[PDB]
Every structure is written in C-alpha cells, then in structure tokens.
Amino acid sequence: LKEKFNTEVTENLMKKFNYSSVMEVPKIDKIVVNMGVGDAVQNSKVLDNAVEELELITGQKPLVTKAKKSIATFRLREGMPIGAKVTLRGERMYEFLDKLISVSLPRVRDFQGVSKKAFDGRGNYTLGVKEQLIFPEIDYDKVSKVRGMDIVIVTTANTDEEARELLANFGMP
Amino acid sequence: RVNVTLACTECGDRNYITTKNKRNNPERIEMKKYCPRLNKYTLHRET
Amino acid sequence: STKNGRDSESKRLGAKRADGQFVTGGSILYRQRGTKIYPGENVGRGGDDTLFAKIDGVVKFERKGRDKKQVSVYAVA
Amino acid sequence: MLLPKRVKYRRQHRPKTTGRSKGGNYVTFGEFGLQATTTSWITSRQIESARIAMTRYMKRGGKVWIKIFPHTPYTKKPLEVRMGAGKGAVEGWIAVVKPGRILFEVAGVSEEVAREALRLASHKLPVKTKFVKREEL
Amino acid sequence: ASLKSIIRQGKQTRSDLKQLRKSGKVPAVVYGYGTKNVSVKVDEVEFIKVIREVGRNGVIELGVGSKTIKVMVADYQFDPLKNQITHIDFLAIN
Amino acid sequence: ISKIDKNKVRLKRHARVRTNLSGTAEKPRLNVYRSNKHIYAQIIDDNKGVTLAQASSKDSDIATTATKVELATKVGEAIAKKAADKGIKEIVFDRGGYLYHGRVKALAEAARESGLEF
Amino acid sequence: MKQGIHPEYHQVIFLDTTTNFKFLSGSTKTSSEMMEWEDGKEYPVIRLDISSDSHPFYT
RNA sequence: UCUGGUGACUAUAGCAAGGAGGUCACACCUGUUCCCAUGCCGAACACAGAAGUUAAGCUCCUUAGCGUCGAUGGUAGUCGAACUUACGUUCCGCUAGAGUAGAACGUUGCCAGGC
RNA sequence: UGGGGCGGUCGCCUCCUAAAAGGUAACGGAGGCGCUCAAAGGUUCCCUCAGAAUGGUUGGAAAUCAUUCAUAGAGUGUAAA
RNA sequence: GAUUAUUGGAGGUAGAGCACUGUUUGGACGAGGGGCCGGUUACCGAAUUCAGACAAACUCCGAAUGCCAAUUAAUUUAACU
Numbered sequence: 001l002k003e004k005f006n007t008e009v010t011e012n013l014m015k016k017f018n019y020s021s022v023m024e025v026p027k028i029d030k031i032v033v034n035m036g037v038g039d040a041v042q043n044s045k046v047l048d049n050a051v052e053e054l055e056l057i058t059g060q061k062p063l064v065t066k067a068k069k070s071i072a073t074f075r076l077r078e079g080m081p082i083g084a085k086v087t088l089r090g091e092r093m094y095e096f097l098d099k100l101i102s103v104s105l106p107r108v109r110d111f112q113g114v115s116k117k118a119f120d121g122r123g124n125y126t127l128g129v130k131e132q133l134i135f136p137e138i139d140y141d142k143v144s145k146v147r148g149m150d151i152v153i154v155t156t157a158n159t160d161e162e163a164r165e166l167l168a169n170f171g172m173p
Numbered sequence: 174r175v176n177v178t179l180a181c182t183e184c185g186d187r188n189y190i191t192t193k194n195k196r197n198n199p200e201r202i203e204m205k206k207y208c209p210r211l212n213k214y215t216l217h218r219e220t
Numbered sequence: 221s222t223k224n225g226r227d228s229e230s231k232r233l234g235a236k237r238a239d240g241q242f243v244t245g246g247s248i249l250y251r252q253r254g255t256k257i258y259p260g261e262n263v264g265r266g267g268d269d270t271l272f273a274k275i276d277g278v279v280k281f282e283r284k285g286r287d288k289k290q291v292s293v294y295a296v297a
Numbered sequence: 298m299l300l301p302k303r304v305k306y307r308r309q310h311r312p313k314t315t316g317r318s319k320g321g322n323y324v325t326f327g328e329f330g331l332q333a334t335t336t337s338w339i340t341s342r343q344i345e346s347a348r349i350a351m352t353r354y355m356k357r358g359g360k361v362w363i364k365i366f367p368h369t370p371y372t373k374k375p376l377e378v379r380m381g382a383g384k385g386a387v388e389g390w391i392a393v394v395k396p397g398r399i400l401f402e403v404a405g406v407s408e409e410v411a412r413e414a415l416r417l418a419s420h421k422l423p424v425k426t427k428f429v430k431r432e433e434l
Numbered sequence: 435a436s437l438k439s440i441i442r443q444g445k446q447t448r449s450d451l452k453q454l455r456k457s458g459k460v461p462a463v464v465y466g467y468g469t470k471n472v473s474v475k476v477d478e479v480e481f482i483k484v485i486r487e488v489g490r491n492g493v494i495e496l497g498v499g500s501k502t503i504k505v506m507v508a509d510y511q512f513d514p515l516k517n518q519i520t521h522i523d524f525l526a527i528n
Numbered sequence: 529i530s531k532i533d534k535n536k537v538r539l540k541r542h543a544r545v546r547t548n549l550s551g552t553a554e555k556p557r558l559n560v561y562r563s564n565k566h567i568y569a570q571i572i573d574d575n576k577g578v579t580l581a582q583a584s585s586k587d588s589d590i591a592t593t594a595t596k597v598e599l600a601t602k603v604g605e606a607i608a609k610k611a612a613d614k615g616i617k618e619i620v621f622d623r624g625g626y627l628y629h630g631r632v633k634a635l636a637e638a639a640r641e642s643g644l645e646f
Numbered sequence: 647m648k649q650g651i652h653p654e655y656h657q658v659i660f661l662d663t664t665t666n667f668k669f670l671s672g673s674t675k676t677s678s679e680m681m682e683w684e685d686g687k688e689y690p691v692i693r694l695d696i697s698s699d700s701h702p703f704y705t
Numbered sequence: 706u707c708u709g710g711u712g713a714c715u716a717u718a719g720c721a722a723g724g725a726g727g728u729c730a731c732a733c734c735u736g737u738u739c740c741c742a743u744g745c746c747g748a749a750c751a752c753a754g755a756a757g758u759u760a761a762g763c764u765c766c767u768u769a770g771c772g773u774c775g776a777u778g779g780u781a782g783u784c785g786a787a788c789u790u791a792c793g794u795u796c797c798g799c800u801a802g803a804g805u806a807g808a809a810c811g812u813u814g815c816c817a818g819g820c
Numbered sequence: 821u822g823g824g825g826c827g828g829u830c831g832c833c834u835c836c837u838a839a840a841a842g843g844u845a846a847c848g849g850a851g852g853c854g855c856u857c858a859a860a861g862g863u864u865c866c867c868u869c870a871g872a873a874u875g876g877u878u879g880g881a882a883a884u885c886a887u888u889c890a891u892a893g894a895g896u897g898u899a900a901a
Numbered sequence: 902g903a904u905u906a907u908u909g910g911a912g913g914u915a916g917a918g919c920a921c922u923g924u925u926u927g928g929a930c931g932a933g934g935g936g937c938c939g940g941u942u943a944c945c946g947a948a949u950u951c952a953g954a955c956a957a958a959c960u961c962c963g964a965a966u967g968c969c970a971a972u973u974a975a976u977u978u979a980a981c982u
Contacts, residue, residue, distance in 0.1 A: 001669035023733080024760035029529055030748070034885035036878055056673065059655030061648075063745045065884055073880050083884040087746045099660060099670035102697040105704075113703055118875065122529075122887050126876035136692065137674035148877035152886050154529050156761095172703060174856075198858065221828040222383035224849060228833050234841060238969040239910035250911090253901075257911095278970090281910050286715045289911095301925055308849060310837080310957050315792055317781085319918080321953060322514045326928090334515070336792045366926050368954055380822050382847050392954085395792085397515050432512065434485055434519075449796065451779085463778045465806055471777045509805055511779060521779040523805065529887070533732080533762050534749090561710055563731070565755095568710060570816070577712045579816045584710095586729075587818080595753085597740095627866085629741070630751060647737080647747070750867100782917050783964040799964060802918045836958045840914035841967055850958075872948100881933085893922080900958100 002094045008169045016165060026123065026157035026166055031088035031096065033058065034150040039074075040081060050147060051084050056138050058096060060086045100133070101170045107133035113172030116164075123157030123166075126150075177202065179217035184208035189217055237279050242297075245276045249291055258284055260292030299341045299367055300390045308384045309369055314338070318397035324431050326362045327404030329411045331418065334425040338391040339400075341367040347418040351401065354414045359405025367392045394424060437484055437496035439464075439474040446473075460519050464498060464505065466526030472498055478519060496524070504528060541625035549622050550574040556615065558607070558639070558646070559622045560632055567600050567631055569607040569639075571619065580615070583607035600631045604638030611644070618645040658689035664698035 009025045019025060035054055040047045047064070054062045065083035067076045076082065088096055105113045108130070118126045129149035157163050167173055174194035178187050189206050203218040233251045237243050250257050250271040259265045260282070262274045273279070277295040284290040314336050324330040344365065351361060367390035374385040394400065401418060403411050412428055419426040442461065446454070451461065458479055464472045476496075484494055485507070495502050508523035551557035551574040561568045566585035573580065583606040585591070590602040608616070621639075626632045640646060654673050661668035661682055668685035670692065680690035 001667065019760070021758065021760050023758050030746085030886095032885065034877090037884070055653045058745095059653050059671070060745050061651040061653075068884070071880095071883060074883060076883065081884095085745075085885070087748075089746055089748065092746080095657075095669065095671050098667065099672075102660075102662075102667055103695060105701045106696045108702065110702055120874050120876090120887060122874090124875085124887055126874090126886070128877050130877070137672040150877055150885055152876080154886065156529065193858075194856085202858080222847060222849090223828090224383070224851095225829080225847075226833090226851085228835090230843070232842060235911050235968075237911095240970045241968080242970090256913090279910090283715075299926095303925080305924060305955090306849075306958070309955085310849090313792095316917095317515070319781090319954090323952095325952060332514070363927065364953075366954075368925060382822095382828090384848070429514075432514070434482065434490065447797080461779065463806095465777065467806090471806090473778065523778075525806070531733080531761075532749090535732085535762090537749095557711095559711065563710095564733095565728095565731090568817090570711065572711065572815085574712075577814060579711070582710090582817055584817075597752085627741090627750075648743075648745080652745085782915105785965100801916105801964095802920105802962065838957105839916095840912050840963090840965085842912100891921095 001098045002091075005094075005169060008166075012165055012168055013162075017162070026155055026162050028093070028153055028155045028166065029089075030154050031086075031093050032152055032154075033086050033088070035062070035084040036148060036150075037082050038145075041075065044081075046145060047081060047084075049143065050145075053135070053143060053147060054084055054086060057134050058086045058088065059092065060088070062086050099136075103136060104133045105172060110172075116173050117160060119160035119163060121160055123155040123159060123163035125153045125163070127152060177219045179204065179206060180220050181206075181208045181210075181215055181217050183215060184210040184217075186210060187220070193219075239279055239281045242278055243273050243276060243293065245274070246272060248272050249279060249293075256289070257281070258288060258290040260284075260290035262293040262295070263291050298345055299363075301368060304368075304370065307370055307387055308372060311371070312338075312369060312391075312393040314393060314395070316395055318395040321364055321399055322397045324399055324402055324429060326364075327360065327402035328406075328431060329404070329408070329415065330364075330399040330402040330429050331415045332427045332429045333394045333398050333400055334396050334427055336395045337393075337422075337424040338371075339365060339367070339394055339422065339424070341390050341392070343422055344392075347401070347421040350421055351403070351414045351418040354417055355403070355406060355410065358410070359403055362402045364399050364402060365392045365394065369393070399429070400424075400426070435484065435488055435493065435495050437476060437480060437494055439476050439496055439498050441499055442473040442475050455518070455520065460522055462522045462524060464496075464503060464524040464526060466505070466524075466528075468526045468528050469498075469503065474498060474524075476522065481519070481522070493527070494524075538625035545625065546622065549620060551620065554615070555618055555620045556580060557622045558619050558644075560624050560626065560635065562624075562626065562631055565596070567596070567603050567635060569603055569635065571607065571611050581607055581610045583610060597631055597634045600635040601638040604635035604640075605642055608639045608642040608644050612642075616643050616645075621646050656688065657686045658691060659686035660692035661685045661690060662692070662697050663694050664696075667698065668692075 009022065013019070013025050014022070033054065035050055038046050038050050051062050051064065062084040063086070064081045065085060067078065067080040067082050070077040114127060120126065127150070129151055131147040131149060134149075135143075153163075155163060155166065157166060164171075164173055174192060177191055177193055179189040179191065180187050186208065188208065189204075193202060201219040203216055205214045206217045207214050208217070231251070233253070235250055236248050243249070248270055249263065252269055252271075254269060255265070257271060259271055260280075262277070264272055264274050266272055271291060273293045275293060275295055277293045277297065280292050280294060282290060282292065318333075322332075344363065344367070348361070348363065355361070369391050370387040371389055371391055372385040373388045400422070401415065403414060406414070415426075415428050439462070446461070454461070454475060458477050459475045460478050460481065462474050462476045464474060485492070488494060490507070492506065494505050494507075496505055497503075503524075503526050505524045505526050508525040510519055510523065511521040512518075513520045549557065551572045553573040553575060557570075557572045557574055559570045559572055561570075568584045569582070570579045571581040572578065583590075583603050585596075585599050585603050587606070590599070590606055592599070592602075594602075611619075621636055623632055623636075628636065655671040656673075656675070657669070657671045658675055659668040659680060659682060660670035661680065666682075666685060668682065674691045675689045676691035678689050680693065681687040682690075
C-alpha cells in the first residue's frame with residue numbers, strides 16, 4: 001500500500017510542481033512518537049505500563065528517555081526516566097500510517113481534524129494526539145490512565161505547503 | 174574512606190597498599206598484582 | 221580587620237631554554253598549565269604538562285596552526 | 298544618583314588622570330555640547346547639580362544628553378583613623394574626564410539659550426570648559 | 435577646485451611635522467588609481483576655502499608637481515581641542 | 529532534515545586517527561580508501577610525503593565479479609606482491625576512517641598473509 | 647532487528663467492507679476466519695469499522 | 706595528464722549567491738539472505754546488489770555579498786637626552802591599534818588510471 | 821602589630837596588584853583546601869555541543885519531542901587561572 | 902666570566918587600543934506579563950540594528966627588558982671552581 005505514494009509522486013507533485021527529475025520529490029523520513037512524562041515517583045509502574053502501551057501501538061521496543069537536567073519547579077534529577085519514544089522508518093512507518101489515518105479521524109470526532117498549519121516551515125508537523133484511535137489490537141480493557149501522544153512527521157520537504165501537498169495523501173487539511 | 178592492604182597467598186608479603194571507602198565497597202577486594210617473589214602476577218586480597 | 225592576606229607560592233613557569241640553543245637529551249623546555257605550547261618533533265609532554273626534549277639538538281619554537289605554537293628539537297650537530 | 302546597578306568589584310584602583318581623552322570627543326546627539334579642557338574626576342553629585350541647573354533654565358524646552366557616566370566607586374575612611382587596616386567603605390562614584398571630552402549635549406533650543414544653559418552648568422563642574430557645535434569640514 | 439600642493443621629500447621627523455603644522459600647512463597623502471602614493475603638504479586656509487565652496491563630498495583638481503589630479507577627500511584627522519585639521523587623505527577618482 | 533555525506537565524516541575520523549600514524553620509510557603507511565564499488569591501497573612514506581606502491585580494485589590486473597571482498601583479498605595480495613620487491617617489512621596499516629571489519633579487514637588479512645610484517 | 651524484545655506484529659487482514667485496506671499488522675491475531683489471498687491470508691480481525699465509509703470530514 | 710586518492714602551507718584557502726555538468730571515476734539509489742549493527746529503528750554502521758538518478762553531495766565557471774588579509778601616510782604610546790618634576794614641554798630613535806586605498810573565490814608535492 | 825592592648829593571625833592552592841621572562845611588599849583586592857573516585861583509573865577502540873528561536877499531549881511560556889543556526893558560550897567531581 | 906652590534910625566538914609584556922567574550926552604560930525597534938476582553942495600550946522584561954567604560958581581577962597587537970646563537974668585531978686578564 002506504499003505504492004499509492006508511488007503514484008502520489010506524480011499524482012500531484014510532478015503535476016503541481018513539475019520538478020526536473022523524480023529524485024527531487026518530497027518524501028517522508030521518520031516518525032517520532034514521544035510519549036509523555038508520567039511522573040515516575042510511583043508512576044514507574046505506570047512508566048512500564050505506558051511503555052507496554054506504546055509497544056502494543058508499535059512493534060518496536062521503546063527507548064526510555066531520562067531527564068536531561070536536575071531542574072527545579074519539578075522533582076527531577078539526572079536519570080529519572082520521564083519519556084519514551086519509537087522511531088519508525090520504513091514498512092513500519094507505512095504500515096503504521098496507512099492503518100492510522102483510516103481510523104484516526106473516525107475516533108477524533110472533529111470536522112477539520114488537526115489544523116491546516118501546525119508547521120515549522122520545513123515540512124514538519126508538531127502534531128498532538130488525545131490517544132483513542134490507537135490501541136486497536138488490545139483496547140481499554142486493562143489500562144487505567146488515558147494517554148496522549150506527540151507525533152511529528154519529518155520529511156525531505158523544505159516548506160510547509162509541500163507538506164500540505166503530501167498531506168493531500170489522506171490528510172486532514 | 175580507609176587504607177587497605179593487599180596480601181599475596183604465596184608471596185608471603187604485604188607490599189601493596191591502596192584505598193577504598195566502605196559504603197561503596199563493603200566486601201573484601203582483590204586484584205591480580207605482580208609480586209616479585211614468585212616473579213608473576215598473582216591474586217592479592219584485602220586483609 | 222580584613223580577610224585578605226592569603227596568596228600562593230609562585231611556581232616558576234615559563235620558558236626554560238631558548239630558541240636556537242643546544243640542549244641535552246632530557247631537559248625541560250617549558251613549564252605551563254595546560255598546553256600553551258604543544259610538543260613537536262622530538263619533544264614530549266610531561267604529566268604536569270612539562271615540555272621536555274627527547275634527544276639532544278637545537279630547540280625551535282614555531283607556529284602550529286593559525287593560532288597555536290609548538291616546540292621541536294632538531295638533531296643536527 | 299547616577300550609579301551602576303551591580304559591580305563585580307566594590308573596591309577598585311583609582312583611575313589614571315594623565316593623557317587626552319580616548320573617545321567621545323564629538324557632539325553626536327544634539328546641536329551643542331560642553332567640552333572639557335582640563336582633567337578631573339567627576340562625582341555624580343556634580344552631574345546631578347549640573348543637570349538640574351541646565352534643565353530648569355531650558356524650561357522643559359529641548360533635550361539633553363549626558364555623555365558621562367560614573368562607573369567607578371571610590372572609598373574613604375569615615376572618621377580620621379589610624380593608617381591601614383584594609384580599605385574603607387565605598388563613598389561615591391566617579392567618571393574621569395580628560396581634555397577633549399564632551400560632557401553634556403543639548404538640542405531643540407536656540408543657540409544663545411544653549412550657551413546660557415551650558416554656562417550655568419559649567420559653574421557646577423570642577424573642570425574648565427568650552428561651548429562647542431557640530432563639526433563639519 | 436584648484437588647490438596647490440608641494441611634495442614632501444623623504445623622512446619628515448616629528449619636529450618638522452609640528453613645525454610645519456605651526457605654519458598654515460597640513461600633511462596629506464594622495465593615493466588611488468592613476469598614481470602612486472605621494473606625500474604632499476597643503477595650505478590649510480586654502481583647503482578650507484575649497485571645501486567651503488565644493489562641499490565635503492566634492493571633486494578637487496589639485497596640482498602635484500607637474501600634473502593635476504581629480505581627487506576627493508577620503509578621510510581627515512582633526513584635532514578637536516584646538517580645531518585644526520591635522521592630516522588629510524586624497525583619493526584619486528579619475 | 530538533511531542527509532550528511534559519508535566522506536567528510538570519514539575524513540574527520542581519519543584525521544583523528546592519523547595523529548600517531550605516520551610512514552617513516554621503514555614502517556611506511558598502508559593507506560586504504562574504499563568508495564562504494566572498489567577499494568584502493570597506497571604505501572606512503574609520510575616524512576617525505578611520497579607514495580611507493582599502489583593497487584586497486586579497478587586495476588585491470590585484478591578485475592572480476594567476485595564479492596567486493598574476495599576482490600579486496602586480491603587487492604591486498606596485489607599490493608603485497610608489489611611491495612614485496614622492496615621494503616616488504618613491518619608496515620603500519622592505516623584504515624582511513626573505516627572499521628577494521630568487512631572489506632578493509634579482508635584486504636588487511638590478505639596483505640598480512642603474504643609477507644607483510646604488520 | 648533485535649530479536650525478542652519487540653512485540654509480535656504480523657500482517658493480519660485489516661480488510662473492511664469499505665475498500666478493504668488489509669495491509670496493516672499487529673498482534674490482534676483472532677481466529678483466521680477470512681484468509682483472503684490477495685489481502686492478508688491471516689487473521690481477519692479488523693474486518694469492519696467506519697474506516698472508509700463516514701469520516702467526520704470525509705463522510 | 707584531466708580527474709581521483711594522499712600530503713604541505715596562517716580562511717588570500719571559508720560561508721553565501723548565481724549558472725552548468727556525469728559508468729576510467731563519484732555519489733545519492735535498491736534491499737536484509739549472510740558478517741555485523743543500532744542504549745528503538747538497515748537512519749548510521751555492515752554486507753549483497755545495480756533497476757533508477759544529476760535532484761542533493763561532488764566538480765567546474767561567475768560574483769567581493771558576509772567573513773579573511775591589508776599597505777602608504779598621519780596619530781596614541783615609549784627607550785635615551787635636555788628643560789623642568791608642568792594632569793607637562795622640547796629634541797632624537799622605535800613606531801602601534803583603529804580606519805582608508807587595495808588584495809583574494811588558493812598555490813604547491815607524490816601516485817595511478819585516463820591519456 | 822603604622823606605640824601597646826582589644827580585634828584579627830601560624831600551613832597549603834589559585835587569581836589581581838606585579839611595570840615582554842622569572843621574582844617581587846603591605847593589618848592591599850577577591851576566592852578555595854585539610855579530599856574524593858572500583859570507575860570519575862587504563863585501553864583497543866568504538867560512539868560523539870548546548871542555548872536561541874521554531875511548535876508542539878504534556879506545555880512551569882521552557883521539563884522529555886522535532887528542524888536549523890548555534891564554541892566548546894555547553895560540558896569538564898572540586899576554587900580560580 | 903664576562904662586558905658592548907646584526908639575526909631568532911619566548912612573554913602574548915604592559916602603555917596604548919578594543920579580535921569573540923564577561924561586566925557596566927546613555928542608542929533606537931516589534932513580539933510577551935500586561936492595560937482590557939483570549940488581545941486591543943502604557944510601562945516593564947527579553948530580543949534584534951548608534952555612541953561610551955573596565956578591561957586591577959581582557960581580548961587582536963606589540964617601546965624598552967630578558968634568554969640565546971653566532972666557525973661573526975672594540976673591552977677586562979680578569980673568570981668560574
């Protein structure tokens with residue numbers, strides 16, 4: 001189902017932009033799924049739980065980011081694992097995304113869905129997630145705290161509008 | 174933090190003095206150090 | 221009263237031989253903290269960053285990059 | 298009442314007073330200024346006096362820039378006491394002026410009003426002075 | 435637009451520079467294209483008169499030796515404490 | 529995003545390597561360069577800055593369709609034969625910015641098998 | 647590609663009655679009730695949803 | 706004898722912008738079976754390829770645009786001397802920093818193919 | 821010990837005063853030490869900057885996440901150099 | 902041993918002057934608490950574009966000093982032990 005994108009290279013982009021060669025088409029590189037704090041005073045069990053949740057969401061074991069400093073305004077030090085992530089690259093990326101956007105706005109209950117622009121100007125999303133359309137393999141039958149994700153699509157695109165044209169491939173503009 | 178003495182079981186000498194602190198290393202420590210009686214490396218152990 | 225009468229004993233840092241003079245095989249060329257001067261040919265760096273000669277010859281201070289210096293010792297006799 | 302907000306060192310060596318002024322020898326902000334012809338320390342109560350005298354003659358007319366700021370503290374011993382048990386407490390703040398340096402500038406006023414304002418200011422200052430205009434040529 | 439100049443010969447010392455400034459002269463250089471660097475001296479009051487009529491950013495046809503050069507004032511060093519020009523640079527613009 | 533090129537990163541790592549690595553005409557340097565389809569080998573005295581031998585994976589004496597690894601084995605064998613005539617003694621192997629693994633390890637082992645005393 | 651720590655995902659048939667986008671995967675391995683061969687010939691367990699019929703934008 | 710490996714010189718050698726290019730090269734590129742690998746991920750490293758590609762890297766050519774270099778002249782300062790210890794002056798040596806004009810889009814060694 | 825007393829001090833380290841080297845006084849101006857470390861030692865290797873904006877479930881606006889510029893401005897067990 | 906010319910280095914010497922900086926000042930500019938309805942504004946804080954001060958506790962240079970070399974000249978028969 002990647003081959004739809006292998007039509008989308010010229011289904012819009014060699015149409016609407018007409019590059020000199022098929023090499024300079026924009027192309028999505030990585031998916032980062034930064035989980036959240038889940039402040040592990042006692043939530044180390046909730047840390048393990050949310051890590052297992054992201055495991056059920058994505059077939060890669062997450063990396064547990066620790067705290068980068070020993071700041072005030074929060075009880076945190078060096079160490080103190082306060083985040084998780086998974087970098088999705090290829091078939092996992094396409095298999096995740098094609099499955100995701102089929103169910104995503106169906107469990108979002110929104111007309112527009114995200115925003116026409118959350119972008120940085122380099123074709124990067126900064127997308128927020130309220131965590132319901134996910135876990136479609138093992139549901140809320142055993143988890144207690146709801147979650148939320150921070151998901152950014154990074155591309156070889158250089159501007160936000162070409163990210164919109166790539167977001168014409170099953171997007172919420 | 175205290176001084177420790179390493180003892181060779183066959184050299185019959187206590188020639189190697191080092192340091193350690195106790196809450197990090199409560200056990201008796203040991204190393205492979207050269208003792209020149211037997212002219213080889215042997216196990217020295219903290220007394 | 222005050223609270224300010226402390227100092228330290230000055231260490232006699234700086235150059236100990238000159239450019240162009242002949243040194244013997246192990247003598248101290250430069251005392252410094254850090255590497256103000258780097259070692260070059262036949263010059264070794266001590267553990268307190270002392271720069272010493274490794275053969276006998278003539279000491280040459282030269283530049284190293286845009287902005288660094290080095291000492292080398294050439295064997296010519 | 299000009300003084301810095303913080304200093305790194307409260308006790309400083311005292312400035313050298315020989316030479317001519319390093320910078321600030323030109324009127325750059327207004328039309329006229331007051332140039333110093335000898336050398337002194339200027340102590341920021343002199344600045345406050347010379348600024349107050351100059352302001353009320355102008356009757357809130359033009360504008361006045363102060364090109365001098367006191368960065369340096371100076372100490373003194375409070376009562377006259379035995380010599381040397383350390384440095385004394387900080388007493389005031391000085392700038393150091395050498396010949397060449399503009400002290401004040403004004404704009405937005407006629408020439409003779411400016412001459413009278415700068416003359417009234419100059420009688421407060423411990424240094425000899427000279428009214429100047431913008432350089433050209 | 436018609437200043438006259440005299441070529442300074444080699445190695446003015448510090449004494450004759452200030453002796454020359456005690457008269458109405460000012461030291462000057464001429465450089466740019468068309469010429470080499472020439473160390474000249476210039477009368478001060480005449481230069482002020484030329485500048486007053488030609489503008490600060492003007493063109494001057496000043497004579498060095500035989501030839502005349504079209505030239506503009508590049509920079510100048512001024513002594514603000516006694517208001518005299520103390521050095522002037524001439525840029526040959528052709 | 530931007531893709532970093534591999535060769536400049538290789539050159540940085542190679543510069544850090546070549547700081548206790550030099551050829552002194554009795555231990556001369558054996559520099560290796562692999563791009564994407566071949567490999568190349570030079571034997572250099574660094575003190576004069578002069579190379580002495582050369583072999584490559586696109587040289588017609590050794591050019592076939594094996595692996596890029598048995599190819600590298602041939603390149604090592606070739607440079608050992610070429611330097612075998614003179615100064616075939618202990619050399620110093622300069623791996624460039626590359627891991628001692630795969631192609632480079634293969635050429636090193638092939639050169640080591642056949643007379644070179646490193 | 648580190649064996650063991652990764653959750654077992656596998657291409658089970660996500661074939662809806664709405665265009666049958668059966669190219670997804672995961673661990674929702676129910677009984678292999680439908681093995682469509684041009685789709686995933688595996689567990690069919692994502693067999694129907696509102697996936698490609700009535701989106702809240704694309705109804 | 707053009708490239709390309711690899712050395713030497715203080716960026717005069719760099720950044721930016723504009724324009725061209727390709728199997729003796731060179732990279733993007735295609736994949737994970739195997740060596741090996743990611744504190745997750747063939748992204749990187751590694752290996753096997755060679756369908757595509759000059760878009761980007763890279764090369765080559767234009768710019769002084771930002772950095773870099775930068776005189777001549779004239780000033781601060783200063784050794785020595787003489788007045789005098791004036792917030793100095795004078796004579797004689799050394800002449801700065803800054804700033805102006807101007808340079809500069811690199812020279813050069815070795816090697817092998819291409820020639 | 822700018823009489824003595826009272827107050828403050830005996831040692832070591834680092835700056836400044838300190839004036840091309842080095843050295844250099846005061847009851848002159850500022851700070852530390854009286855240890856720590858089984859890795860915070862060795863070593864092949866391997867692998868290798870923050871902040872600033874940017875815009876994002878969290879959002880202290882910034883904790884983690886992402887892009888690009890960012891000088892070792894980061895970082896370096898411990899004071900300064 | 903010496904003592905007194907040319908050539909080379911070292912200190913990055915200071916005096917001067919500002920090569921990023923660190924600090925201290927009077928420039929002039931739109932965004933954020935905010936004035937208000939979550940913003941409209943002022944003032945502030947911070948950020949980018951003129952002119953000053955320390956650079957006693959600074960960075961780019963360098964009078965005189967010092968170290969030295971000459972297969973190099975006038976001086977002291979004294980030297981260093």
